[PDB]
Swiss-Prot record:
Keyword Glycosyltransferase in record: yes
PTM sites of type N6-(pyridoxal phosphate)lysine: K654
Reported regulation of activity: Allosterically regulated through the non-covalent binding of metabolites, being activated by AMP and inhibited by ATP, ADP, and glucose-6-phosphate. The activity is also controlled by post-translational modifications including phosphorylation.
Keyword Nucleotide-binding among UniProt keywords: yes
Catalytic activity, as annotated: [(1->4)-alpha-D-glucosyl](n) + phosphate = [(1->4)-alpha-D-glucosyl](n-1) + alpha-D-glucose 1-phosphate
Cofactor list: pyridoxal 5'-phosphate
Name assigned to this protein: Glycogen phosphorylase, muscle form
Species of origin: Oryctolagus cuniculus (Rabbit)
One annotated GO molecular function: glycogen phosphorylase activity
List of residues binding AMP: D31, Y64, R292, R293, F294, K295, S296, S297
Modified residues (Phosphoserine): S3, S403, S487, S720, S721
Highest taxon above the source species: Eukaryota
Length: 810
């Protein structure tokens, strides 16, 4: 069909078809008379999977022979999404499989929709890890993703009566063809117990044991025959466990609950024991696995030369004291030597500055669950503060500010401080975020060790986020500049010379229109809700959170609605406002925001006077698979977090690469995106970080904005009076009260500039040709945001390894 999807060779299409039938028969035990679409999906999945194994085996054999430095990316989240299409794209099998299934009388797209999303992540943090794995494989790095195989990933979101309802994500229900259980590599993990101090060294004894069973998932690089591994641990109770008989067996559930479910919090720390167990479980199993692999390749001096451990935020921070524990207690290295190795091995990436998101574990929890680790942490702190005291003599406050131990109601361990002390590199995920780290939260640490601090702006993989979800766009681009850009996104700059090309302008616009038509259709297919494909698609999809300000978007929507009702026969650019995202189950305000959005839709979508001029739709169950559908269809990308709160954002990059213009604040990566494309080609508005600080010093008083802005006042009064909730007039009292008296995110402060900026957007949309030309200017300069660039920087500036675009013999 299309170029970038590879060749549909005669021999390969024939081979695919027979292997497809082979699996349908021998693997699924079905014939064409009783096979269902799901059976066909699995038959295709196994057929494609077969093509991975050969490459997987030799890639691993290759690393064993050459023994390069290994990169271990530790994360409690990996938001992988679907694997079938991504695998075909990276193996250049898409057209062949498309043809083969066509000849078998099947629609491959229909089959791809059957695959369950692997949702082992909450959002941006987990998705970044997924993009990173893809890029590390594409750049030929000997990298391993290590995490937890949650039985239940992020919950599926159902909207009932306008409210979010959660339901278990039983993603393993029908089985997972992409994972290979490796029970032979099961490792023991210890919990509780006590510390015994003997003649030579301390011993952690009387512990309760849980087994960690690994499951390996292949991670194919883009057309380079490299297939790396993502190893996820599953909790298994030992057999002598708790060994009435029946009860003892049933109580195994206790130990195995460790890998049962993903905590559904985004940018929010919940200090529960189960979560701490998950964090140690992944770290303990991973480190033993890492050391085992190393001992094959006694003098750990070379450990840092053969191993790099990247901590995805502080979630796996226990890797530092655990590594010390193993080196000191088990390998018997002197403290100083062990510490040197640990620091040179570990690197930490911070993904937030929000106080409620930082991990601060109660000492009493670590005391009971991990007694030896607590001792090691105290020793680390003791030695670290001695260093601080020597550098800043007499500065007693600095000592208490930098301590890993926070005093107060209950003593807590600041995991971020632990990570900085035990890592040779600490990085932010966007230039502005990394600067904020050095100027605020980690200022004291930056002053003590400036060399440790770096920036590594986030990125997204152009394979899944362009080629896979937007083949039409990838095609028209390849037509003009070739296919090299897929693994070298910077080449998109060449598209700048086509900004005045009438043919190109027309094609870019045509692809967008086709995507919108396809999405508009999907909305009626699976969700039954009519929308106008000619309207501007205004979308904000991301987790529901106060800092992301879906509420600001809501205020604008209501403003648009009120303006139409005031002057019905006045022309306005038609818009379809789409907002989607999940709210953490225990985040009340977030759940109220979802209700507000659907409530606004209830009024707006049924008002005769509005017609098809304005529609408000809440995209149910936003997840990776849905993102792949809506992003390519978007015209306007909403990235409106309060300046200084969105560490980076990555959804923003996805929209930019897919032909949507961006309306946003100078926050996170938005700053660099505007810088790359040019501010004239971006819709920037609102306070900058400095303005937010100025307002805080003075004191934020929402009442002021309410008193000076009639349109804003009207909206608040509509919310308070029950205009959007007739049966329950005071339904949104909490929202109004928050907005008026304790809005940490200054929604009102950016309201005027936001509405004004939105008017500029509507003005440009009225001129199809110029809107599209600006779009081309965005797509052409999105190259910097490829995770290949990000990973190349991590590789050279932190891990000390050189990326390679060399194909392996397949
Ligand atoms: C590549 C990736 C994931 C895989 N899972 C299995 C599984 O391995 C089991 C034995 O342990 C088999 O019994 C099972 O049929 C097979 O699918 N084989 C794979 C090849
Ligand atoms: C690994 C192995 C055996 C275990 N037993 C418990 C149990 O978990 C319960 C709830 O978290 C605790 O109340 C209980 O004291 C603990 O023994 N947690 C384990 C972890
Ligand atoms: C604690 C828990 C969950 C989190 N998610 C993110 C997210 O991570 C993404 C990838 O860097 C960022 O782009 C995003 O701005 C940040 O909120 N930061 C977190 C901190
Ligand atoms: C990319 C992505 C995110 C991150 O979006 P932001 O707007 O940066 O918060 C969250 N969820 C999903 C499913 C994603 O694909």
């Amino acid at each position: 069909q299309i170029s970038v999807r590879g060749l549909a060779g005669v021999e390969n299409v024939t081979e695919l078809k027979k292997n497809f039938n082979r699996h349908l028969h021998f693997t699924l035990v079905k014939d064409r008379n009783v096979a269902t679409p799901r059976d066909y999906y699995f038959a295709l999945a196994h057929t494609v999977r077969d093509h991975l194994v050969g490459r997987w085996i030799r890639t691993q054999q290759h690393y064993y022979e050459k023994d390069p430095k290994r990169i271990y990316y530790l994360s409690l989240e990996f938001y992988m999404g679907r694997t079938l299409q991504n695998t075909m794209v990276n193996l250049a099998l898409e057209n062949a499989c498309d043809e083969a299934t066509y000849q078998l009388g099947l629609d491959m797209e229909e089959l791809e929709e059957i695959e369950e999303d692997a949702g082992l992540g909450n959002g941006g943090l987990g998705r970044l890890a997924a993009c990173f794995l893809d890029s590390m494989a594409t750049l030929g790095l000997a990298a391993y993703g290590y995490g937890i195989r949650y039985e239940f990933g992020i919950f599926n979101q159902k909207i009932c009566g306008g409210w979010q309802m959660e339901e278990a994500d039983d993603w393993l229900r029908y089985g997972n063809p992409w994972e290979k259980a490796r029970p032979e590599f099961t490792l023991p993990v210890h919990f509780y117990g006590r510390v015994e101090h003997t003649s030579q060294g301390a011993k952690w004894v009387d512990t309760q044991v849980v087994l960690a069973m690994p499951y390996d998932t292949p991670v194919p690089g883009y057309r380079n025959n490299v297939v790396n591994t993502m190893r996820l641990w599953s909790a298994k109770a030992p057999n002598d466990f708790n060994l009435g008989y029946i009860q003892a067996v049933l109580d195994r559930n206790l130990a195995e609950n460790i890998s049962r479910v993903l905590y559904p919090n985004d940018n929010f720390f919940e200090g529960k024991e189960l979560r701490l167990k998950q964090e140690y479980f992944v770290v303990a199993a991973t480190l033993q696995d890492i050391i085992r692999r190393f001992k094959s390749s006694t003098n750990f001096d070379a450990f840092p030369d053969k191993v790099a451990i990247q901590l995805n935020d502080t979630h796996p921070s226990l890797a530092i004291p655990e590594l010390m524990r193993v080196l000191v207690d088990l390998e018997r290295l002197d403290w100083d030597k062990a510490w040197e190795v640990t620091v040179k091995t570990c690197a930490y990436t911070n993904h937030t500055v929000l106080p409620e998101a930082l991990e601060r574990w109660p000492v009493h929890l670590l005391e009971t669950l991990l007694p030896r680790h607590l001792q090691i942490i105290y020793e680390i702190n003791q030695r670290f503060l001695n260093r601080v005291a020597a550098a800043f003599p007499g500065d007693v406050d600095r000592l208490r500010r930098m301590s890993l131990v926070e005093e107060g109601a209950v003593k807590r361990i600041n995991m971020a401080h632990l990570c900085i002390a035990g890592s040779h590199a600490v990085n932010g995920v966007a230039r502005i975020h990394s600067e904020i780290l050095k100027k605020t939260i980690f200022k004291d640490f930056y002053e003590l060790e400036p060399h440790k601090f770096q920036n590594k702006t986030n990125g997204i993989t152009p394979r899944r986020w362009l080629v896979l979800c937007n083949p039409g766009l990838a095609e028209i681009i390849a037509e003009r500049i070739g296919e090299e850009y897929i693994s070298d996104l910077d080449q998109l700059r060449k598209l700048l010379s086509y900004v005045d090309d009438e043919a190109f302008i027309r094609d870019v616009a045509k692809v967008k229109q086709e995507n919108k038509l396809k999405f508009a259709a999907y909305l009626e297919r699976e969700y039954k809700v009519h929308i106008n494909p000619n309207s501007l698609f205004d979308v904000q999809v991301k987790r529901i959170h106060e800092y992301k300000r879906q509420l600001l978007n809501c205020l604008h929507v209501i403003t648009l609605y009120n303006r139409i009702k005031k002057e019905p026969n006045k022309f306005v650019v038609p818009r379809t406002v789409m907002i989607g995202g999940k709210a953490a189950p225990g985040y009340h305000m977030a759940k109220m925001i979802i209700k507000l959005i659907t409530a606004i839709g209830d009024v707006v979508n049924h008002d005769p006077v509005v017609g098809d001029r304005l529609r408000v739709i809440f995209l149910e169950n936003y997840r990776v698979s849905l993102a792949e559908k809506v992003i390519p269809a978007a015209d306007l990308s909403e990235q409106i977090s309060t300046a200084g709160t969105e560490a980076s954002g990555t959804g923003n990059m996805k929209f930019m690469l897919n032909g949507a213009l961006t309306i946003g604040t100078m926050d996170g990566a938005n700053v660099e995106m505007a810088e790359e494309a040019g501010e004239e080609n971006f819709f920037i508005f609102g306070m900058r970080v400095e303005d937010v600080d100025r307002l805080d010093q003075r004191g934020y008083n929402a009442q002021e904005y309410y008193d000076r802005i009639p349109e804003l006042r009207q909206i608040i009064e509509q919310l308070s009076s029950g205009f959007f909730s007739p049966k329950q007039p005071d339904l949104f009292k909490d929202i109004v009260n928050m907005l008026m008296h304790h809005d940490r995110f200054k929604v009102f402060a950016d309201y005027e500039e936001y509405v004004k900026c939105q008017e500029r957007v509507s003005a440009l949309y009225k001129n199809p040709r110029e809107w599209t030309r600006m779009v081309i200017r965005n797509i052409a300069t999105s190259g910097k945001f490829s995770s290949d660039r990000t990973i190349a920087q991590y590789a050279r500036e932190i891990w000390g390894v050189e990326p390679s675009r060399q194909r392996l013999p397949a």
